[PDB]
Design an enzyme around this catalytic site. Structure first.
Site, PDB file in Angstrom:
ATOM      1  N   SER A 155       0.870  -1.175   0.000  1.00 21.90           N
ATOM      2  CA  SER A 155       0.000   0.000   0.000  1.00 21.90           C
ATOM      3  C   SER A 155       0.913   1.234   0.000  1.00 21.90           C
ATOM      4  O   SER A 155       1.871   1.292  -0.781  1.00 21.90           O
ATOM      5  CB  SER A 155      -0.928  -0.065   1.238  1.00 21.90           C
ATOM      6  OG  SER A 155      -1.837   1.014   1.287  1.00 21.90           O
ATOM      7  N   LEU A 156       0.657   2.183   0.897  1.00 19.11           N
ATOM      8  CA  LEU A 156       1.577   3.306   1.131  1.00 19.11           C
ATOM      9  C   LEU A 156       3.004   2.849   1.555  1.00 19.11           C
ATOM     10  O   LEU A 156       3.997   3.514   1.239  1.00 19.11           O
ATOM     11  CB  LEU A 156       0.955   4.260   2.160  1.00 19.11           C
ATOM     12  CG  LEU A 156       1.196   5.776   2.171  1.00 19.11           C
ATOM     13  CD1 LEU A 156       1.289   6.408   0.801  1.00 19.11           C
ATOM     14  CD2 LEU A 156       0.131   6.513   3.010  1.00 19.11           C
ATOM     15  N   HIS A 265      -7.356  -4.471  -2.550  1.00 18.65           N
ATOM     16  CA  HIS A 265      -6.110  -3.855  -2.086  1.00 18.65           C
ATOM     17  C   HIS A 265      -5.326  -4.818  -1.176  1.00 18.65           C
ATOM     18  O   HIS A 265      -4.087  -4.896  -1.256  1.00 18.65           O
ATOM     19  CB  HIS A 265      -6.439  -2.546  -1.369  1.00 18.65           C
ATOM     20  CG  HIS A 265      -5.258  -1.642  -1.139  1.00 18.65           C
ATOM     21  ND1 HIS A 265      -4.324  -1.368  -2.111  1.00 18.65           N
ATOM     22  CD2 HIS A 265      -4.897  -0.912  -0.056  1.00 18.65           C
ATOM     23  CE1 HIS A 265      -3.426  -0.525  -1.634  1.00 18.65           C
ATOM     24  NE2 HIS A 265      -3.754  -0.228  -0.390  1.00 18.65           N
TER      25      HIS A 265
END
Ligand SMILES: [Ca+2]
Ligand SMILES: [Ca+2]
Ligand SMILES: [Ca+2]
Ligand code: NA
Ligand code: NA
Ligand code: NA
Length: 449
Positions: A155-156, A265
């Site tokens: 993700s980030l 995700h």
């Protein structure tokens, strides 16, 4: 215009490309180390369940810990965390302990990610700086080279890994698990994960539709030496889709105040988890597009073989930037094995669906549909399917045809020949029969003479 500096980390300005650009309009400075509260939590084979803290401020904490200087190290860095699965990171450590002796460092920057989205996105600069500082401490103080190190960032966290790598010459690997689009896609190499951030960068794409209107959190941009798009990279089997909207409340979603189906995700790490114990479960095929792949244009594997998506991707021999496609299951076990078959029909003209099942020394597959329509003798139909196991050496195959209409005269259809190709094997298997069968009845074909 503005700059903030932090002990041992350098300075960070709110200038382009960080702020004031089309993609990143707001001029933002990262939060301080103190406000972000990054923690380095070590797990080892010998302390698998409870962490030992490693301190940037006190490098001798490494010496005091069970950190092993002759083992490889994997840092695992979170991004988005879903309310109902906070422990995937430590689940990943434990999965790695099953196959290897390794130092597993979980980078907890929750306080730093607990911000507005765009603040969290800038806070990545500091967390990446910190991971880089840890890698420098290991190199200088412990003679422990970044060639022994792998950053896994979700993700980030993927872009945190990117930042660490850019400041760490000789870093061996980064895996980006569905790197986020917002504030990173299409930005310069400096801002985001990209192949220069490590010797080998592999990226798994699972939520790659545009953020607006599709709410795909991930990016479709190629950010690695190897970019994998399982199931097309945009919508995963078993995952519900987000509702389409011209309004996206990133701040709300990131905070967990607004609804978001995180499934797609999250799948990136779920596939990675599984790959650790299934070293052949995720063969991925070089292809120009998912549509081309599904049209049976990109099979079998090239001469140099297919890479595995996930943990064993670094084993892959024949490496510029390459795009790879594969399908996974809808649930655990996600692993699939792709086969290609051609069936040459015999008997009389009928109408229906033709199916095949493969029987080998390791087991057998279910029946897979190959074609549905008018079945004419002498005609060949070919198809590719993703089965749930490697059947091993194929001893025999079973053919069947069926329709859902009454056929008063009881026609018989067979196959004179069926060829089977496994994705990763060079040898084609040929099966033969003179026989034909009644509807919905299994015909067994044995090796051709
Ligand atoms: Ca970069
Ligand atoms: Ca029937
Ligand atoms: Ca019928
Ligand atoms: Na020690
Ligand atoms: Na450095
Ligand atoms: Na996206």
């Amino acid at each position: 215009m503005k700059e903030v500096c932090y002990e041992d980390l350098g300075c960070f300005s709110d200038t382009e490309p960080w702020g004031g650009t089309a993609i990143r309009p707001l001029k933002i400075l990262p939060w301080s180390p103190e406000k972000i509260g990054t923690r380095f939590l070590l797990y080892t084979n010998e302390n698998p369940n409870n962490f030992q803290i490693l301190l940037l401020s006190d490098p001798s904490t490494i010496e005091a810990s069970n950190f092993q200087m002759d083992r490889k190290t994997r840092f695992i860095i979170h991004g988005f965390i879903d309310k109902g699965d906070e422990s995937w990171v430590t689940d990943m450590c434990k999965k790695l302990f099953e196959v290897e002796e390794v130092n597993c460092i979980c980078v907890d920057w929750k306080k730093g990610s607990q911000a507005t989205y765009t603040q969290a996105a800038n806070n990545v600069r500091v967390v990446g700086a910190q991971v880089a500082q840890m890698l420098d401490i290991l190199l200088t103080e412990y003679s422990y080279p970044p060639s022994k190190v792998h950053l896994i960032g979700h993700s980030l966290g993927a872009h945190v890994a990117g930042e660490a790598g850019s400041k760490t010459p000789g870093l061996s690997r980064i895996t980006g698990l569905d790197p986020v689009e917002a504030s990173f896609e299409s930005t310069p190499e400096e801002v985001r994960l990209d192949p220069s951030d490590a010797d080998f960068v592999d990226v798994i794409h699972t939520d790659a539709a545009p953020l607006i209107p599709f709410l795909g959190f991930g990016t479709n941009q190629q950010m690695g030496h190897l970019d994998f798009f399982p199931n097309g990279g945009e919508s995963m089997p078993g995952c519900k889709k987000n509702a389409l909207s011209q309004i996206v409340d990133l701040d709300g979603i990131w905070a967990g105040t607004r609804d978001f189906v995180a499934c797609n995700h999250l799948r990136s790490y779920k596939y990675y988890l599984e790959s650790i114990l299934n070293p052949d479960g995720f063969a991925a095929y070089p292809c120009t597009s998912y549509k081309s792949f599904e049209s049976d244009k990109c099979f079998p594997c090239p001469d140099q073989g297919c890479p595995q998506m996930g943990h064993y991707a670094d084993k892959f021999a024949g490496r510029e930037q390459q795009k790879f496609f594969l399908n996974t299951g809808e649930a655990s076990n996600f692993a699939r094995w792709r086969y290609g078959v051609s069936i040459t029909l015999s008997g009389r003209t009928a109408t229906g669906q033709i199916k095949v099942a493969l029987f080998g020394n390791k087991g057998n597959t279910h029946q897979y549909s190959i074609f549905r329509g008018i079945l004419k003798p002498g005609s060949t139909h070919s198809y590719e399917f993703d089965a749930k196991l490697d059947v091993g050496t194929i001893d025999k195959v079973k053919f069947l045809w069926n329709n859902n209409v009454i056929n008063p005269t009881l026609p018989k259809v067979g196959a004179t020949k069926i060829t089977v190709q496994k994705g990763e094997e060079k040898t084609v298997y040929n099966f033969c029969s003179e026989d034909t069968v009644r509807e919905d009845t299994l015909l067994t074909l044995t090796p051709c003479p």
